[PDB]
């Protein structure tokens, strides 16, 4: 290939071929005059070295070099590694009819459809536009189609809307991890210059909105469209291929809103009334005459399917909260009422969705899913849960606990200056006493934060569960745990140094108050260590995954029944304490090998 200028960027193979042919020609010329054996042997050895270099460079010592220092490549180098044909140009190849951009949310979409920008909509489907335009006879040739598509008149957008109605597309994340890394949606035209993707899908991709890039593809032929419509929707992937739990679990915000929904308080406006059905509970709530969460007796009519496929209509008077009735408005017919009486956190809602799928079928499950997402966003926005700076109440006994711990370590040190104790044992003792102080202060802070609220209950007084914003946000299961709230409120415990031991001085300051310089400096060690570890661990895991996946490539199920009688004895694991996993989650979804006998043997 000639480049910009009077020089030609020669390839390595050309240079190697020139060298080998030049040496061969020189040797052919030399032997004609019957040269002495020494020189012909020397030039033969030159030729042999050169041909070995061409065939495989770098296997022998003193590998040949090109321009300045870089060793020239050869065919053996052209086959191997990431720079070779097999793993770079054959297994994975660049494809046309594709595009990429950044992602936004757009939470007003249904989960079987996604947004798609106008510009890509025009650019990707140009052949389809040409075909439809030629069928409608607005152009005798293709050049007029060129002008019309490049000028984007008002007559092309209607055609584009017509050709997109039922044409599935594929979305993709660059570091795809599992089989949910590829899904298909039904595109919907939208303005802007970004793709809108349904929030509930975002848990599967493990994709945040910090600049992730999605790549689009178009199934071209007819069979591709039908196959994508039969297998590639998000509606046909409701359970993970790794475990039986649903993978469309509400991740962060809707779970917070729903956890705000149901937590009855002892006293609120609108106590002690009786309602007909849930359909007027909203009427009371939105008029401001009744608080969102309050004790109330209402009549609920749930449909149950004890009979052979038909639903039984039974009615009663249940003691519940208004918000629970409002949620009962959205549940399908099958589910019994006793499933929305609890705090309804994250695990509870996941299990409830799982049993809804298990009992009612498939379509009601997906309808319930997107409806619950809508209502969760609406009521979470209504609630307005904001974090404040006075919401982190520090326990008042922290100072005295710290003083006692310091007095104990001081007297232990004084005993050390008496020459009665060694170094390792006092080290272990001070570590133990600091751990004891840490857990004690953590327990005190948890106790006086989680239930600090007290109410007169329209009487003398009563103690109820607290409505602190941070506690509510951490106990729901949306984001956070006990460790993070403990670090943010109480002292952070004992950090470790790169040697692996534990620094003798704990950090006696939480994030709400200030931090001394060395206290920050020590935690810098752990931060850097964690970042380096997470840098290298992904690189290791990718190679391990490739090694696992290459070996099981050819195992394909081919027969419906082998017909044997040999099986493996299955028993629950007992490590030496409490049972870790029972038979329920270990034998489920398997075929029996031998008949199960009750301890009524011969039964």
């Amino acid at each position: 290939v000639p480049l910009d200028g009077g020089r030609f960027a020669t390839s390595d193979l050309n240079d190697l071929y020139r060298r080998v042919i030049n040496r061969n020609n020189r040797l052919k010329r030399l032997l004609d005059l019957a040269a002495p054996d020494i020189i012909v042997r020397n030039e033969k050895r030159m030729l042999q070295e050169a041909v070995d270099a061409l065939l495989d460079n770098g296997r022998r010592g003193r590998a040949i070099t090109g321009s300045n220092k870089r060793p020239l490549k050869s065919l053996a180098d052209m086959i191997k590694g990431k720079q070779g044909r097999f793993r770079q140009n054959l297994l994975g190849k660049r494809v046309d009819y594709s595009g990429r951009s950044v992602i936004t949310v757009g939470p007003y979409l249904r989960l079987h459809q996604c947004g798609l920008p106008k510009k890509m909509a025009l650019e990707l489907f140009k052949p389809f536009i040409y075909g439809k335009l030629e069928l409608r006879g607005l152009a005798t040739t293709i050049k007029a189609a060129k002008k019309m598509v490049e000028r984007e008149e008002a007559v092309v957008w209607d055609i584009l809307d017509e050709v997109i109605r039922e044409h599935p597309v594929l979305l993709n994340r660059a570091p795809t991890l599992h089989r949910l890394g590829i899904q298909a949606f039904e595109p919907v035209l939208i303005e802007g210059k970004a793709i809108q993707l349904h929030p509930l899908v975002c848990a599967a991709y493990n994709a945040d909105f910090d600049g992730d890039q999605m790549a689009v593809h178009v199934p071209l032929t007819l069979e591709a469209q039908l196959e994508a419509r039969a297998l590639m929707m998000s509606t046909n992937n409701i359970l993970s291929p790794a475990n039986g739990e649903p993978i469309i679990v509400p991740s962060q915000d809707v779970v917070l809103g729903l956890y705000y929904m149901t937590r009855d308080c002892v006293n609120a406006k609108g106590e002690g009334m009786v309602l007909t059905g849930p359909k007027e509970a909203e009427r009371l709530y939105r008029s401001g005459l009744a608080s969102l969460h309050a004790r109330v007796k209402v009549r609920i009519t749930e449909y149950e399917k004890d009979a052979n496929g038909e639903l039984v209509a039974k009615t009663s008077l249940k003691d519940t909260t208004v918000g629970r009735a409002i949620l009962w408005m959205i549940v399908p017919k099958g589910l019994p009422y006793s499933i929305v009486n609890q705090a309804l956190g994250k695990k509870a809602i996941s299990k409830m969705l799982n049993t809804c799928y298990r009992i009612l079928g498939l379509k009601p499950t997906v309808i319930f899913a997107d409806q619950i997402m809508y209502t969760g966003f609406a009521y979470a926005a209504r609630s307005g849960a904001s974090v404040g700076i006075d919401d982190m109440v520090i326990p008042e006994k922290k100072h005295e606990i710290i003083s006692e711990a310091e007095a104990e370590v001081a007297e232990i040190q004084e005993q050390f200056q008496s020459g009665l104790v060694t170094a390792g044992e006092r080290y272990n003792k001070v570590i133990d006493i600091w751990a004891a102080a840490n857990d004690r202060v953590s327990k005190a802070m948890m106790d006086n934060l989680q239930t600090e609220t007290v109410i007169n209950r329209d009487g003398q007084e009563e103690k109820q569960v607290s409505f602190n914003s941070i506690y509510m946000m951490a106990d729901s299961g949306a984001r956070g745990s006990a460790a993070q709230i403990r670090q943010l409120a109480g002292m952070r415990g004992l950090m470790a140094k790169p040697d692996g031991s534990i620094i003798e001085t704990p950090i006696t300051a939480n994030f709400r108050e200030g931090l001394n310089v060395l206290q920050y400096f020590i935690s810098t060690h752990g931060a850097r260590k964690g970042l380096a570890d997470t840098a290298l661990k992904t690189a290791n895991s990718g190679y391990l995954t490739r090694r696992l996946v290459d070996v099981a490539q050819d195992l394909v199920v081919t027969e419906d029944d082998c017909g044997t009688h040999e099986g493996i004895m299955m028993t629950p694991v007992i490590e030496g304490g409490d049972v870790k996993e029972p038979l329920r989650d270990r034998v489920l979804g398997r075929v029996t090998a031998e008949d199960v006998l009750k301890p009524g043997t011969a039964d």
């Binding site: 054959l90 190849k93 494809v95 990429r100 939470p107 210059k193 032929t221 974090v387 404040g388 951490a474």
Partner: protein, 1337 residues
């Protein structure tokens, strides 16, 4: 006490600790490194003159000719900086050197040379440093980063555990010279001494010792102590020293003076040793079996027979004992060789060696160095004397010698550049002691074993390489010299040195491209410590200890700033107060404390001696006398932290700001934030984008002034005075009386930098911020640069923010923005793109740039002139033509018959530049480069005329202003001593020389004024001639190109859903949807909020500092709007004065103590007017304000104290049941636009090697489907789509043509075929001897 321009906007500051040392010249490393390389250094030290004195003096092969060095001098640069970046030539200067060549006659080597010749010769070109501290190489500015390398000297590594998998730790001691071959020693599981050279095969250690002219007896005596055996008439009496019996094993009954001391079968006690010391026992009787394991050291020869009785280093036996006893020997000397005290390593190594001859050792060394060569004595001797003891190849630096001496505890810290026998034997002895158990190993991570390079050292090294190359060249040329028939310029050539310097400055791993789009970005780029580069580590060979921070990093290198990703901890950044020691180590300031008084004088401590002393923390309270208020203060002695007494410390920290670097020190409320999010926020802050209109940051750190002044972006005033004529283009300053030179005082002239292309496609502009008649003081800001305001650093803007989840549009990290933000037009950024067109020379004739273009109509030509160049100001969009550029491909092959056939139905073709698809904009400037000898078109003539007019008008205005000031100065001088109010200026000022006056200092002062006036007019004429000649001449370009057209597009980018915005605590996110103003929530006062974040991120990303920043901003605006309300009514000055005074005291003991009684009424009025947009608040990094100050300051305003205000909703219109938090936060825009990553492709170009679509965005290509993608698709039942996608859409050509024809026809059917990339693999594997083929169907 404040200067006048600090009176415009005083920044309230918190803090209690009084600082003692202000921020130094923040950009000092580059400048003070480079002010050693291009300087005439007398007597020679660490400079170019040293390099010449090191390599240049050369004596030929007894040719009586010598080439010596005299001096050097650098001429003025041919072009200034501006011409350099506008053209593309290197900002370099010629390097003149005066050289002396002498040739002697016969019969005498030492006498006076018969003939000499001296002249100036040219050699090479050196890039210069601009006053910004940067380099210009090829029309492109570039920056050099300092490198951290491995320190020269001796070092003792240990290699814990891994080797031999047995737990027996080995020990190695390597010597790393500054320039030469390596040398290292190590052990084996067999406990032997081994020498290795440059990682080659293993050799025994004694070979070097024997080669250094040491006999075996000398070696044994040096490495071991001596014990004497005396054969008396009975039992071989032995001389005893009691201290040697520590840990030795007994074999008999030890008795002396007829008294039993040690019992048979038992081991010594300390009391027995004490008893032996009491009795001073010296000689004891010894059994013959006690000498059954000792080895003789020296040889014994029989006098009578003349043979060798016992050789060196072999164990003695009873028969040998009898022979030596009967030979008449009385003194018998042997070894000590205890199990724990002294290992017999030297003895066993000398046993295991195969040779015992120095010539044999030289033969072994010579064969090892060069395999397959017959050794000889002279070659081996020369090679051994040249490997280690030759000045040319081996040379330790002064730093290397100092460290080498220090690690061995010698006395004189000065020595030569080569090593000697004493050094190597001492190294061996130290290694033996380390193995023996005395002494300690040395780690690597300690900063006392690491060194920082800079520009000067690397430049000198490359220059020395160039000189050694030209040196061997001049030697080989002078070996065939002649009697001064040639002049001394032919041997010296400008090719090697220039090539070396150009390749170093242009293509090196450390000459990295400048990344500038913000002043902070360059303040943090030039202060970079990279661990990579030549002589350093590699990315894939870095473990974990090199990445983790050592506990000696406090105050020298930043612990919290580093680029996250593949290289963490190798690109660490230098601290704020840190400097470079003279030798090259890092050091940080401290304060020396007396017994009770903390003296204010500053002492510098390196990274080694600090550990010996003890250092107290900076954040410790103290009294006015320096006494510590407590009796215990936490400190650090040796990498630990503990509690010490009232008086045991000797040094004190200077301030609390020295732990961090400049990158992250701008984050307010840092001490309340985690390390991870602090690192991330620093990274985003480094990568901001200029805004159209900068706004002051509400919550700063009080350091922005230094970072704004010290960057090369703001035209800081040089000399004080008063402004006289301000304009959007230039600024002139009238000089004060006390700052004038005696001659040619005049007045200063500046030149602002208007809209010009930046380096990262942003736009740098300068706006004058000085009024008219405003006096200025020396070293002050006049005109701010990009992202700066009144001398402060303003990256983004401040906006009203509120925290709540809002209808899911802020799901996890997305942000929604009201239309108000884009309404005020406050996030608009300006981007400048450069489009180039080349006019090369090809076959069949050159191409034409005329506007004669076919196949287009008036619609495509209405925007072009006659020449073929777009006008300035023509609003161009995607689909127009900028330059009409046509390539005459030719091969027309005209025929009288076949050519008219083409015209029956229904050459040069266009190659014009194409606008990038999607971007609008306006053209601002068109610049043309033409090779000399080519006819310029009309537009080139007009452009060069415009440049001539601009240059002449600029020079004329400069003369006009300069001489106006000069004559004003003349009038001011003439006011005294014969003043004429009107008699002087009857006739114009041109003749003020014929004035009759007395002769005094005033008179000859005026004479000097007139003389310099005449000199000025002459010089201005000369340089006007020179400038017009320079601008009228042509310019050299690349070979083979005819002319170059440069056109600049200037697109204006707005905000749109898809852009990335981030705070200063790491809470990044992409905006999601733009909303009408009515929909966002509003408060009871009526004002709407602008941005709503997501509160869900606070528990996990525990960056609690953002909430505190929000509350502080709310407080600032609560003061600001109150000031606004007081100002809107025309109120008198006393009430606002007292209100501002109350606002400024407002706290406990601080360092400000400002007063308003010393402000003029006009001045306080202007201060109030400039403060209406809120009160800026300064907060130190680790000495910030607590909660009580915030509560009190909010109480000063009428805002609720709890910080949570009740808020209403816009959609439904009812009160939220829980109040939310609102306030003001500093929000940034990053340089990741949405109209840069959006891409689509239907069918574009195809590659040539394999018919596959290309990759990238600039090349119109598509995305890649990886192997994990294939696995994910295969995991489903996906069959047809995978085959179709990797067969038709990718590889097959006939398949895809058929598919296209079918799609345009309305059918959908596929024919697979076979991919051609597999056919490529087939051919390539067939290219070998393998027979690859495909069998039957």
């Amino acid at each position: 006490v404040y200067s006048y321009t600090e009176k415009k906007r005083i920044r309230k500051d918190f803090g209690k600790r009084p600082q003692v040392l202000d921020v130094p010249y923040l950009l000092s490393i580059q400048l003070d490194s480079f002010q050693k390389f291009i300087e005439q250094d007398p007597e020679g030290q660490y400079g170019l003159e040293a390099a010449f004195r090191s390599v240049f003096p050369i004596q030929s092969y007894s040719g009586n000719s010598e080439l010596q060095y005299v001096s050097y001098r650098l001429g003025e640069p041919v072009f200034d900086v501006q011409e350099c970046q506008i053209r593309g030539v290197t900002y370099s200067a010629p390097l003149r050197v005066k050289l002396r060549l002498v040739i002697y006659e016969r019969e005498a080597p030492e006498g006076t040379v018969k003939d000499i010749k001296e002249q100036e010769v040219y050699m090479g070109e050196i890039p210069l440093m601009t006053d910004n501290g940067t380099f210009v190489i090829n029309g492109t500015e570039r920056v050099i980063v300092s490198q951290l390398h491995r320190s020269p000297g001796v070092f003792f590594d240990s290699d814990k555990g891994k080797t031999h998998s047995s737990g027996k730790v080995l020990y190695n001691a390597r010597i790393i010279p500054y320039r030469g071959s390596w040398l290292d020693f190590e052990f084996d599981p067999k406990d032997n001494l081994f020498v290795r050279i440059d990682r080659r095969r293993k050799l025994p250690a004694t070979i070097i010792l024997r080669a250094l002219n040491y006999t075996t007896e000398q070696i044994l005596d040096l490495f071991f102590e001596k014990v004497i055996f005396e054969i008396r008439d009975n039992k071989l009496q032995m001389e005893l020293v009691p201290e040697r019996l520590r840990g030795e094993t007994a074999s008999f009954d030890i008795e002396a003076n007829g008294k039993v001391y040690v019992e048979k079968g038992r081991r010594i006690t300390a009391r027995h040793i004490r008893q032996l010391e009491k009795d001073d026992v010296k000689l004891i009787e010894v059994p013959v079996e006690y000498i059954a394991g000792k080895v003789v050291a020296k040889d014994y020869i029989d006098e009578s027979t003349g043979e060798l009785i016992c050789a060196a280093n072999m164990e003695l036996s009873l028969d040998l004992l009898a022979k030596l006893s009967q030979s008449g020997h009385k003194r018998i000397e042997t070894l000590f060789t205890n199990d724990l005290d002294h290992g017999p390593y030297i003895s066993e190594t000398l046993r295991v060696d195969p040779t015992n001859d120095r010539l044999s050792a030289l033969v072994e060394i010579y064969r090892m160095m060069r395999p397959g060569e017959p050794p000889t004595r002279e070659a081996a001797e020369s090679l051994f004397e040249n490997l280690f003891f030759s000045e040319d190849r081996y040379d330790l630096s002064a730093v290397g010698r100092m460290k080498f001496n220090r690690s061995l505890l010698r006395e004189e810290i000065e020595g030569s550049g080569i090593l000697s026998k004493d050094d190597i034997i001492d190294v061996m002895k130290k290694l033996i002691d380390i193995r023996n158990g005395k002494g300690e190993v040395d780690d690597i991570d300690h900063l006392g074993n690491r060194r920082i390079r800079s520009v000067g050292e690397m430049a000198e090294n490359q220059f020395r390489v160039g000189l050694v190359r030209v040196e061997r060249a001049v030697k080989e040329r002078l070996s065939l010299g002649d009697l001064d028939t040639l002049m001394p310029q032919d041997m010296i050539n400008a090719k090697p040195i220039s090539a070396a310097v150009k390749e170093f400055f242009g293509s090196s791993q450390l000459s990295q491209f400048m990344d500038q789009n913000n002043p902070l970005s360059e303040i943090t780029h030039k202060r970079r410590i990279s661990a990579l580069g030549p002589g350093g580590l590699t990315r894939e060979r870095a473990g974990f200890e090199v990445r983790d921070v050592h506990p000696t990093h406090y105050g020298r290198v930043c612990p919290i700033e580093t680029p996250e990703g593949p290289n963490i901890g190798l690109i660490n950044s230098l601290s704020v107060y840190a400097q470079t020691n003279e030798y090259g180590f890092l050091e940080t300031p401290y304060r020396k404390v007396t017994d009770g008084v903390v003296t204010d004088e500053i002492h510098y401590l390196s990274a080694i001696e600090e550990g010996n002393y003890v250092i107290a923390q900076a954040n410790s309270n103290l009294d006015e006398e320096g006494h510590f208020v407590e009796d215990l203060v936490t400190c650090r002695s040796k990498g630990e932290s503990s509690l010490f007494s009232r008086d045991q410390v000797d040094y004190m920290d200077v301030s609390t700001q020295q732990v961090v670097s400049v990158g992250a020190s701008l984050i307010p409320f840092l001490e309340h934030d985690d390390a991870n999010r602090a690192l991330m926020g620093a990274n985003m802050q480094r990568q901001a984008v200029p805004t159209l209109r900068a706004d002051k940051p509400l919550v700063g750190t009080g350091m922005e002034r230094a970072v704004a002044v010290d960057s090369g972006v703001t035209a800081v005033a040089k000399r004080g005075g008063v402004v006289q004529y301000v304009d959007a283009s230039r600024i002139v300053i009238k000089v004060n009386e006390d700052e004038m030179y005696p001659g040619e005082a005049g007045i200063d002239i500046y030149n602002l930098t208007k809209y010009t292309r930046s380096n990262q496609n942003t736009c740098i502009n300068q706006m004058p911020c000085v009024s008219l008649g405003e006096p200025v003081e020396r070293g002050d800001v006049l005109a701010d640069g990009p992202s700066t305001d009144l001398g402060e650093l303003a990256l983004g803007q401040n906006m009203r923010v509120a925290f709540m989840p809002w209808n899911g549009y802020n799901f996890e990290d997305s942000i929604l923005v009201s239309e108000r933000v884009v309404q005020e037009d406050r996030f608009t950024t300006i981007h400048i793109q450069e489009l180039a067109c080349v006019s090369r020379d090809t076959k069949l004739g050159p191409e034409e740039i005329t506007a004669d273009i076919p196949n287009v109509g008036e619609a495509a030509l209405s925007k072009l002139d006659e020449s073929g160049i777009v006008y300035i100001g023509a609003e161009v969009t995607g689909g127009d033509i900028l330059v009409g550029k046509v390539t005459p491909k030719g091969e027309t092959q005209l025929t009288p018959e076949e050519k008219l056939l083409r015209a029956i139905f229904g050459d040069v073709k266009d190659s014009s530049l194409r606008v990038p698809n999607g971007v609008s904009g306006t053209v601002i400037d068109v610049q043309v480069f033409t090779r000399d000898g080519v006819e310029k078109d009309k537009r080139a003539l007009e452009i060069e005329e415009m440049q001539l007019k601009q240059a002449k008008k600029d020079l004329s205005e400069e003369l006009q202003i300069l001489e106006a000031g000069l004559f004003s100065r003349i009038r001011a001088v003439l006011v005294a001593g014969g003043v004429e109010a009107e008699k002087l200026d009857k006739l114009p000022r041109d003749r003020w020389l014929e004035l009759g006056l007395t002769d005094e200092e005033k008179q000859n002062q005026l004479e000097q004024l007139a003389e310099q006036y005449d000199e000025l007019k002459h010089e201005f004429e000369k340089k006007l001639e020179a400038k017009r000649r320079k601008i009228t001449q042509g310019d050299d370009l690349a070979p083979g190109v005819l002319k170059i057209v440069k056109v600049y597009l200037a697109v204006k980018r707005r905000i749109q859903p898809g852009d990335k915005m981030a705070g200063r605590h790491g809470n990044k996110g992409v905006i999601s949807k733009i909303n009408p103003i009515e929909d966002m929530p509003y408060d009871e006062n009526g004002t709407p909020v602008d941005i709503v974040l997501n509160p869900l991120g606070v528990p996990s990303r525990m960056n609690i500092g953002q909430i505190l920043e929000t509350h502080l901003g709310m407080a600032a605006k609560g003061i600001g709007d109150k000031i606004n309300a007081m100002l809107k009514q025309q109120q008198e000055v006393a009430k606002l004065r007292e209100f501002i005074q109350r606002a400024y005291d407002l706290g406990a003991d601080v360092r400000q103590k400002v007063d308003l009684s010393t402000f003029s009424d006009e001045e306080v009025m202007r201060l109030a007017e400039n403060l209406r947009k809120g009160m800026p608040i300064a907060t130190p990094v680790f000495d910030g304000a607590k909660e009580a100050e915030i509560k009190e300051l909010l109480k000063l305003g009428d805002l609720p104290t709890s910080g949570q205000i009740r808020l209403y909703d816009g959609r439904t219109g009812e009160q939220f049941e829980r109040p939310v938090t609102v306030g003001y936060m500093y929000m940034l825009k990053l340089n990741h636009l949405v109209d840069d990553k959006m891409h689509a492709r239907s069918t574009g170009s195809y590659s040539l090697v394999t018919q596959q679509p290309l990759g990238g965005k600039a090349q119109f290509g598509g995305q890649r489907f990886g192997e994990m993608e294939v696995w994910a698709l295969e995991a489903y039942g996906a069959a047809y789509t995978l085959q179709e996608m990797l067969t038709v859409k990718s590889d097959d050509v006939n398949g895809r043509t058929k598919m296209y024809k079918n799609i345009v026809d309305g059918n959908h059917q596929m024919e697979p075929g076979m991919p051609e990339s597999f056919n490529v693999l087939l051919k390539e594997i067939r290219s070998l001897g393998i027979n690859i083929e495909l069998e039957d169907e």
